[PDB]
Amino acid sequence: TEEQIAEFKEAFSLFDKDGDGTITTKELGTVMRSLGQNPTEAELQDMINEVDADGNGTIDFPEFLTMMARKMKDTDSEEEIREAFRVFDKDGNGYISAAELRHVMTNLGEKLTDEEVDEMIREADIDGDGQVNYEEFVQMMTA
Amino acid sequence: TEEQIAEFKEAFSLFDKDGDGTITTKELGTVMRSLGQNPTEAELQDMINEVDADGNGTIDFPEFLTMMARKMKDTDSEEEIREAFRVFDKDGNGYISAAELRHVMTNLGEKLTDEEVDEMIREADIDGDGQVNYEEFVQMMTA
Amino acid sequence: TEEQIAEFKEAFSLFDKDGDGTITTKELGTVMRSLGQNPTEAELQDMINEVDADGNGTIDFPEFLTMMARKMKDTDSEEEIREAFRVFDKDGNGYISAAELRHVMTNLGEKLTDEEVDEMIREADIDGDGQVNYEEFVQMMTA
Amino acid sequence: TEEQIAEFKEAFSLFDKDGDGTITTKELGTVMRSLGQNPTEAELQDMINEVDADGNGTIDFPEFLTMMARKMKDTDSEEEIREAFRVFDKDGNGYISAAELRHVMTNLGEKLTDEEVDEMIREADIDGDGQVNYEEFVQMMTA
Amino acid sequence: RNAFYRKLQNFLYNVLERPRGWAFIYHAYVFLLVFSCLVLSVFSTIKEYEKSSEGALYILEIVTIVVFGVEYFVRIWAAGCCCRYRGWRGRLKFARKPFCVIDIMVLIASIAVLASALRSLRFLQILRMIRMDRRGGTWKLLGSVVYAHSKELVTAWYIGFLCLILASFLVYLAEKGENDHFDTYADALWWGLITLTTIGYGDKYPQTWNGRLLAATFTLIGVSFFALPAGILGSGFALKVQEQHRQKHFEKRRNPAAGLIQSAWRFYATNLSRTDLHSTWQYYERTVGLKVSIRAVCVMRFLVSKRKFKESLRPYDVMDVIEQYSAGHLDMLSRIKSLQSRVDQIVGR
Amino acid sequence: RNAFYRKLQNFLYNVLERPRGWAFIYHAYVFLLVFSCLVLSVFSTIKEYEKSSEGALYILEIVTIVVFGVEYFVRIWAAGCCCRYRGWRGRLKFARKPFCVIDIMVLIASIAVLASALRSLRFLQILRMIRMDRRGGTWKLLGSVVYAHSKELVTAWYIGFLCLILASFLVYLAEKGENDHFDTYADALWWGLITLTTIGYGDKYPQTWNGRLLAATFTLIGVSFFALPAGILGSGFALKVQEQHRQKHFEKRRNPAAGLIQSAWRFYATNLSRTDLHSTWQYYERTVGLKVSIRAVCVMRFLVSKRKFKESLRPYDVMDVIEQYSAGHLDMLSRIKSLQSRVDQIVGR
Amino acid sequence: RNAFYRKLQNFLYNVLERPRGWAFIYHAYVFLLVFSCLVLSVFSTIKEYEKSSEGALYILEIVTIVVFGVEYFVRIWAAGCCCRYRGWRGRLKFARKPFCVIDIMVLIASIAVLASALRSLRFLQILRMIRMDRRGGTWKLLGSVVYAHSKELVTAWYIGFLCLILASFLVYLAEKGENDHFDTYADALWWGLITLTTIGYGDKYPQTWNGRLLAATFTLIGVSFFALPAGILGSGFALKVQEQHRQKHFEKRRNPAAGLIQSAWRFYATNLSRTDLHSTWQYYERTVGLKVSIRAVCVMRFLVSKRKFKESLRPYDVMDVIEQYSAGHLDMLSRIKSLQSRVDQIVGR
Amino acid sequence: RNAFYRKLQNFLYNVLERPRGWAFIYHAYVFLLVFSCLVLSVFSTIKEYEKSSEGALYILEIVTIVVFGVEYFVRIWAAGCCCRYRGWRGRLKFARKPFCVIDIMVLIASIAVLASALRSLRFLQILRMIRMDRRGGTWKLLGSVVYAHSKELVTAWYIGFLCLILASFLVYLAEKGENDHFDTYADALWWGLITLTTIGYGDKYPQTWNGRLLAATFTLIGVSFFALPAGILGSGFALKVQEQHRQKHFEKRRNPAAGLIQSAWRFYATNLSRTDLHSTWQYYERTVGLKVSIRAVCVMRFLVSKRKFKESLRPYDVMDVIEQYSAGHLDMLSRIKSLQSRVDQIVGR
Numbered sequence A, B, C, D: 001t002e003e004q005i006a007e008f009k010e011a012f013s014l015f016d017k018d019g020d021g022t023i024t025t026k027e028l029g030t031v032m033r034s035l036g037q038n039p040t041e042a043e044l045q046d047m048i049n050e051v052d053a054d055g056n057g058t059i060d061f062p063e064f065l066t067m068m069a070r071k072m073k074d075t076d077s078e079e080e081i082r083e084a085f086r087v088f089d090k091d092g093n094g095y096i097s098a099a100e101l102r103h104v105m106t107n108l109g110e111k112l113t114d115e116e117v118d119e120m121i122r123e124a125d126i127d128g129d130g131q132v133n134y135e136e137f138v139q140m141m142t143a
Numbered sequence E, F, G, H: 001r002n003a004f005y006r007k008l009q010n011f012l013y014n015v016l017e018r019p020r021g022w023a024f025i026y027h028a029y030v031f032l033l034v035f036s037c038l039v040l041s042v043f044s045t046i047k048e049y050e051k052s053s054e055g056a057l058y059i060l061e062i063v064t065i066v067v068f069g070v071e072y073f074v075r076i077w078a079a080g081c082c083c084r085y086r087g088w089r090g091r092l093k094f095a096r097k098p099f100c101v102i103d104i105m106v107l108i109a110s111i112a113v114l115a116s117a118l119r120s121l122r123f124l125q126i127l128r129m130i131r132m133d134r135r136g137g138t139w140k141l142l143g144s145v146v147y148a149h150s151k152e153l154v155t156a157w158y159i160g161f162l163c164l165i166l167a168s169f170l171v172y173l174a175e176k177g178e179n180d181h182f183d184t185y186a187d188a189l190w191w192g193l194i195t196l197t198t199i200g201y202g203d204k205y206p207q208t209w210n211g212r213l214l215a216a217t218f219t220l221i222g223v224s225f226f227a228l229p230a231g232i233l234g235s236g237f238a239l240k241v242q243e244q245h246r247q248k249h250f251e252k253r254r255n256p257a258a259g260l261i262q263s264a265w266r267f268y269a270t271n272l273s274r275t276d277l278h279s280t281w282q283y284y285e286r287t288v289g290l291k292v293s294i295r296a297v298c299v300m301r302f303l304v305s306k307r308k309f310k311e312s313l314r315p316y317d318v319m320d321v322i323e324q325y326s327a328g329h330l331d332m333l334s335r336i337k338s339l340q341s342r343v344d345q346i347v348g349r
C-alpha cells in the first residue's frame, strides 16, 4: 500500500544513512551499532545480498520493500522450519521440551531472552505442556 | 540400614555444604579442594550426573545413598573390568606383570601410589607371581 | 638476430649483476628489489629453473635468449590458457564477464591494475561485451 | 679376544661414568656432550635399548661387547642397506650420483662432512663415476 | 473433543504418512495382503485349481479394495493436517496430487469390476503393486547412482557389446556351415548374447574345434565385461550408504538453525499480526518509524539468517574437513602474524 | 592340588570356551568328525552301498555322541569357572542357558536312538551341524550388515522383481500361443525367474523372433539387477572389515581404563569388606564420618570413572578425527586469544 | 556477416566437437539411426523377411551416408575454428588426422557400394559402429584401470586357470572311461572351462559318484576365482569415479592460473608485436636496454609462472592433505620458535 | 675384461632375476612357448590329428628343455652376483634353494624322457606351468587377503551352505516320489548345489507346483549367498591396491635412511678393517681407548640408527595422520603453555 511504501521509505532513509537510494554496509554497521549490535562487514554484506537482488552492494528501497512485504507464509520456510525443529527434535516425534527450546534458542548464537522464549512457548507449545508441537506451530506460522 | 542412612546423612551434610538437601558442584569443588584435589566444574557436574538421577544438578541424599549402597558386584562391572584388564592385557592370556600394572595404574591419569598398587598386586595377583590373574580378581571382586 | 642477441646481452649484464656469464639468485633478488618487487630465494631459484636448462643455479645468457626468443605461440600454452579461462569460466560457455576477469586477474595473487586489465578486456573481449571470448583470445594469442 | 674385552672394559669405564657395571642414560648425555653432541634422554635410552638386552635401562659391559663384536656382515643389513639406497635410488637402476648422495647423506639429519662423503664415494662408487653402484657396495660391506 | 479430534486427524495423517517403525509394519502387512492376492491370481491362471480358487481370491480382492478406500478417505480427510489443505478448497487442491488423482481413478475402476477381463485383472494387480512405494524414493535413489556413474556404465555396456558382435561374427563363419544351430547370423547373435550373459540355455553351442578354440578366449572377455555393471552399481550403493551415514555423523547446522528460528520469531513478534505479543516487542524497544525499524531490522537480519541457515544446511565431510583445514592453517597464519606484530610493537619500546 | 585342580577347571573352561589358535583347531577336528558323519549318511541314502555303510556310520555316530557328552560335562562342571555359577545352584542357573538346555535335550534324544527313523536321523545330523557355532556370531554379523543396508537392498529386489513381472507378461503374450513351453502365465513366471537369475536350465526358452527381440533387452536389465545384492553385501563386508581393523588401530582407552580401575581399587580398599587392607586406607587418611568420607569420595569419583571409561570405550576413527580436529582448532583459538590477552596486558605497561 | 559467419563456423565446430548436453543428444539420435540400420541388416540376414527388407535398409543406408558426409564437411570446413588449421594448408594438415583420414576412406568406400558383398556390408556396419566414440576416451579409461590393477588381475586369472587344469585332469581320470562325454582330455578341458565360468550348457557333465564328489569341491573354488576379475574391475571403477569427483571438489589452481595469465599478458604487452598497446608498457615503465628489461623480466617471471601454474595444476586430495598437514605442523613449529625467540629477546631486557 | 666379465654376470643375474619392463617381456615370451606346448599336447590327446602332431610338439619340447637348462646355468653361475654365494661352496648352498633344487630334479627327469608315459607327460607340462611364478608372490598376496577376511568369508560359506541343505531337504520331500530326477537325498544334494551356484545344467529340476513354489524363495536366497565371496574378495583386492598405492604415496623414511647409512659408514670407517681410510677417522678425531671410543660411539649410535630406520620404515597413511594429528595438537598445547609461561614471566616484571 501507499502507506506501507511511504513508511518503508521513511525507515529506509533512517537506514539509508548516505541517502543514495540504497543502504550501504557502513550505514548498516553504524545503524546496528546505534541499536547496540556490532555487525561485521560480512554480516551487513550478507544482509545486502539477502535484500539486494540487482547485486549493487547497497540495499535500495525496492529490495527493502520486497523483503518487508513478504510474510512467513511468503517465505516457503515450512520444510526449513520443520527441518530446524526436527534437528532440535531429537526423538523425531514432533515435540521438544520448551525448556530445552529455551535452552538452545535463547542460548545459542544470536540468542534471545527468557521472556521472548516464554512467549515462543505460549505461541508454539500449543497445548502448553512444554513439548512444543513444532510442526503444528510451523504450519500455523509458516502458512 | 538406619545406621548406614544416618551416617550417610552426616557425611552428606559434610558434603552438603549449602544444606539444600542436595550437593551442589561448588560444594564438591570446595570439599575436594579441602581434601587437596582441585575438581573442575565439569568433573563435579559429572559426579552429580553419576549420582543425580532426577537431574537437578545437585546431589540429594537419596542419590548419594543409592550410589553408596551399591557394591562392585552391584555394579555389573565384570565385562567392563575385564575389558580394561584385557586392554592392559596385551597378550590376552589373562595375566599382566604387576610391575606394568603398577606402571600404568599408579602412573596413568588419576594415578595411585606404590603401596596401594602393591596391595592391588597382593589382592589381584592371586598366585603372587607379578602376573595378576585379572579375570580371577575381577570375578572375585566384581562378583 | 645479432641485434636481439646483443641487446639481450646488454640486458643480461644488467641482470647479470656479478658478471659470471649467468644470473645468480642474488642478482635476481636485488634487481627485482630495484624494480620494487621483493623476490624470495625460492622465486628467483624457480626463475633460474625456468630459464636454466643445464641446471647450474645461475641463468647464463644462452638460457635467457632461449626463453626470450619464445612467443606465446612458441609456448604451447593453448590447452593451458584455455584451462585457466575455463576454471575462471564457471559456466563453461567460453565467456566470462570482463568485470569478474578484472576482479580476479587484477585482484588475485600477483594482481595487475585496472588499466592493464582494461586493455586485457579490449584485446580479449573481442566483441567488447564484457564476456571475453577467452578461447578466441587464447587462440589469437597462444597461436 | 681378551685384548678386545679388556680394551672394551677400559672404554666402558670411560662410558660407565657411574661405574655400576652398566651405562646409564646420564652417563650417555654427559659423554656425548663431552664429544660435543647433545643427546636427548630418548636418544640415550634408545641407545640402551639397542645395547641393553636384559632390559635394565643401563648398558652393562656384556651388551656393549655384544654390540661391538658385531660387524656390518654381522648386522644382516643387506636388505636394509639396499632398501635405503633404493629409496635414495630414485630410478631404481642401482646407481645414484655421488653428488646427490653427498647432498642427502652429508646434508640429511645427522649429516656428515664433505670429506667423509668423499671417501664414501671412493669406497662406494666402485667405478668412480659419481653413480655409486650401491648394491655392489652394500654387498662388499654388509657381507 | 474437537481439538483432540483435529489432533488425532493430524497425527493419524502422518500415521498414514511416513511412520517410524510401527505403522511401517502395518503397511507392510498391507503389502502382505496385496502380494498374496497376486500369487493367488497366479494359481488362478491354471484350470486344474480353478474351483479351489475363486472364493478366496474373489472375497479377498473385495476386502482389499475395501481397505484401499479406507486408507484413501483417511488420507483425504487428513489432508488438512498440513497447512495448505483446509476446509474444502485447499484439500481439493491436495486431490490435485497426481498420485492421489490416478489412485482414485484406478480405485473406481477396481469398483467397476464388481459386476480378456482376467488379463486386465492381472494388469490391475501389477499396477496396485506399483502402488507399494508412495514417494517412490527407490527410483530417485537408483537414478541418482546411475547418472552418477553414467560414463563408466555406458563404456562398459558399449565395449562388451562390441565384443558380442565380433564374437558372434567369427563364430558364425566358423560353424555356420558345419552346425545347424548356427545358420543365420541372427542365430549366433542370440547364442553369443546368452553366452556372455552366463545364462547358458545350451540349446545351441559350438562343436567345431575351431569355434570352441576362439570361443573360450572371447568367453574370458565377454563374461567379465557383462558382469561389470552389476558389481559397479553394487559397490556404488555401498559407498554412498557409507558417506550418507557419514553426513549423518556431521550436521553441525544447529547454530544456523537457532539463529534462523530466532530471527524468525523476531519477525513473528515484529509481525504486526500480533501486537499483543510484547516479549520481543519489549525486547526490541529495550535493546535500542520505530515500529518499522524493529520490524525491518528483523526482516533484514532474519533474511540473512534464512540464507545462512540454508547454506549451512549442507556442510559435508571432506568439505568441512578442507574448509576448516585451510581455515585453521590460515587462522594460525593470522594468529602468528598478530604475534609478530604484537611483539614487534613491544620491540620499539 | 585342589587349588591347581580349580585353576585347571577354569583354564579348561575357557579352553572349551573361546580358544586362541590351538583348541580352535581342536574343535575344528570335532567339526571334521561330525561333517564326515553327515556325508556318510549321505551315501547311506543309497541302497547300492548299504552293506558297506552301517558299520562305520553306526559306530562313528556312537563315538560322536560320546565326545558330545564329554565336552558337555566339561562345560557344565567348568561352569563355576566364571563368577555366577558355583556349588550346585548357580551352575544350575547356568544350565538355564537355552543353548545348554536344548543341547542336553537333543543330547538325550541322540541317546534315544541307541535302541521314518532315518529321516529324523538326517534331520538330527542337520541340527548337530547347527551346533557348530556356539555363540552364533555369524548371524549377528550378517544381520548387522543387512539391516545396515536395508533400504538399498529392498529397492534392489523390489525393482528387479517388477522387471521380472513385466518381462514375463510381455513374453507370455509374445509366445504363449506359438510355444507350448509358455502356456500359462505361471509358466513364464517360472521361466523369466530362472532367466534373470542366470541359472538357465534351458528347458523352456523363447523361439518367437518377437520374443527373443524383447527378451535380450530385458535380459540386459534383469540380470544386472539380481546380481546387485550379491556385490552389495560383498563390498559391505570388505569395508566393514577394513573399518573394524581401523578401530583395532585406534582404541586409546588405556587412560580411562587405568583411572577406572584405580577408582575401583580405591573403592575396594574403602570397601569395608577388607579393613585389614591399609595401603589405600593409609593413602586416603594421608592424602587429606572420615571413613564414609574416604569411601563415599571414592564411590562418587569411581562412579564418574565408570562412566568416563565406558564413554571412552568407543572412540572412533573419524569420530576422534573430527573431535580433536575441532578441538585443536578451537584450542588454537583459546591459545591465541590468551596470547592476545597476555601481550595486551603487557601493552598497558 | 563474414565475422558472424566465422563465429558461427567456430561455434558449430565445437558443436560437432564436444557438446555439453544438447548436441550430445543430437549425436545420440545419430547413433540411433546407425544402430537401427544395424538391426535391420540383422533381419536382412534371413530370407523369410527379405522382400520386406531392402527398401528400408537400402534407402536408410543412403540417408546415413548422406548425413555422414554432411557432418564430415562441417568438421573439415570448421577445422580453421582452431588455431593451427587455416586457409587450405593448415586445415590440410588437419586432414592428416588419422581419424579424419580413415573416416574419409571408409566414407568413399560406402559410396562405392552405391552401384560376399553383404558380408562386407555387415563388416562395414560394424566399423561405422566403432565410429561412435570419436575420442575413444572409453578405451583410455579402461586400460587405465586395468594397468592400475595389472598384478592382482593376472594373479586371479593365472591361479584359477591352474585350478581349471587340475580339475579337468582329475575329472578326466574319474569319468573318461565311464562316460562318453569325457573321452579326450580336450573334452574335459572344454567342460571344466564352461563349468567354472558359470555358463553351464549342460551338454556334458559328470555322472560318476567319484567325479561329482571331487567336482563340487573344485566348483566352490573355481567359480569364485573366475568371478573375481568382474567384481575387481567394478569396484575399481566405483572408487576411481569417487576420487575423480573428489579432485573435482579440489582444484585450487585459480591462483597460479591468474598469475600465469598475468605474466602472460605482461609478455604480450612487452611482446613487441603490439607496441601501440601501452597499459602494460606504461605499467612497466611506471613500476620501475629498458625495453628488453621490461620484456625479459616478464619472460623470466612469466616462465616461472608457467611452471608454477602447471605444477599447481594437479594438487590432489590426500596430496594437499599431507602437504599442508606437514606444512601446518612445521609452520606452527616456526611460529612457536619465533615466539620463543621473541619472548627471549624480551628476556634480556 | 674379467671385471666387466663379473659385472655382466651380476647384471645378467638380476636380468634373470626381477626385470623392470624389458626382460619381463622376455620371460613372457618364454611363457608363450611353454603355454603353446601345453595346448599342442592338448591337441595331441586326439588321434584324429596325431600324425600332424608329434613333429612340432616333439622338437619344440626339446627346444624348451634346452632354454630351460640355459636359464638354469645362467642362474647358477650368476649366483655369486649376490654376497653369500661365491667360489663353489656358497653358490652350492645357493643350490640348496628348494626352488632351484626341485627345478633341477624335474629338469633331469625332462631329460629322462629323451629316450602311461604321455599321461605323466601332461602332468609334467602342468608342473612346468607352475614354474611360471618364481617367487610365487601371487599366493602370498591371495592368502593375505583371504586370512584378512577369514571370518566373514567363513560365515558366508557356512550360512549359505546350510541354506543348501535345508533347501535340498524340503525339495526332496516335495518331489522325491513325483519325479525320478529326485530319488535319493544325494540327488537333491547335487541338484540344489549346482542350482544355487548359478550353473544350471538343467538335467534335473522341479516339476511339482509345490517344489517350484518353495524353490524360487530359496533361489533368491542361495544364489546371493554363494555369489558373496566373489564380490567380497574382489572389492578387497581393489581396496588393498588403493591403500598400497597410498603408502606408495607416503614413505618419508629418507631421513632415517640417511642417518642409518651415515652411522653405518661411521662404523665402516671406525671398522678397523680399513684404517687407511681417514676421512671419518679424521672426522671422529676432529669432532671431539680413543679408537674404541670413536668406534663404540659409532656402534651405539649406528645401532640406534638401525632401529630408528627400521621402525621408520613403515609409517602408514592414517598412522602418520593420527600421530602427527595428536602430535600437532599436543604440540600446540606445549607451544601455548610456553606462551603463557613466557608472558607470565613478563607479568612479574
Ligand SMILES: O=C(Nc1ccc(Cl)nc1)c1ccc(F)cc1
Binding pocket: E065, E068, E069, E099, E102, E103, E104, E106, E107, E108, E109, E110, E111, E127, E128, E130, E131, E132, E133, E134
Ligand atoms: O492404491 C491404489 N492405486 C495406486 C496405484 C499406485 C500408487 Cl503409487 N498408489 C496407489 C488403488 C486403491 C483402491 C482401488 F480400488 C484400486 C487401486
Ligand SMILES: O=C(Nc1ccc(Cl)nc1)c1ccc(F)cc1
Binding pocket: F065, F068, F069, F099, F102, F103, F104, F106, F107, F108, F109, F110, F111, F127, F128, F130, F131, F132, F133, F134
Ligand atoms: O551338541 C549337541 N546339540 C547342539 C545343537 C546346537 C547347538 Cl548351537 N549346540 C549344541 C548334541 C550333543 C550331544 C547329543 F547326543 C546330541 C546333540
Ligand SMILES: O=C(Nc1ccc(Cl)nc1)c1ccc(F)cc1
Binding pocket: G065, G068, G069, G099, G102, G103, G104, G106, G107, G108, G109, G110, G111, G127, G128, G130, G131, G132, G133, G134
Ligand atoms: O564415420 C565414418 N567412419 C568412421 C569410422 C570410425 C570412426 Cl572412430 N569415425 C568415423 C563413415 C562416414 C561416412 C561413410 F560413407 C562411411 C563411414
Ligand SMILES: O=C(Nc1ccc(Cl)nc1)c1ccc(F)cc1
Binding pocket: H065, H068, H069, H099, H102, H103, H104, H106, H107, H108, H109, H110, H111, H127, H128, H130, H131, H132, H133, H134
Ligand atoms: O623349470 C623347470 N621346473 C620348475 C618348476 C617349478 C618352478 Cl616354481 N620352477 C622351475 C624345469 C626346467 C628344465 C626341465 F627340463 C624341466 C623343468
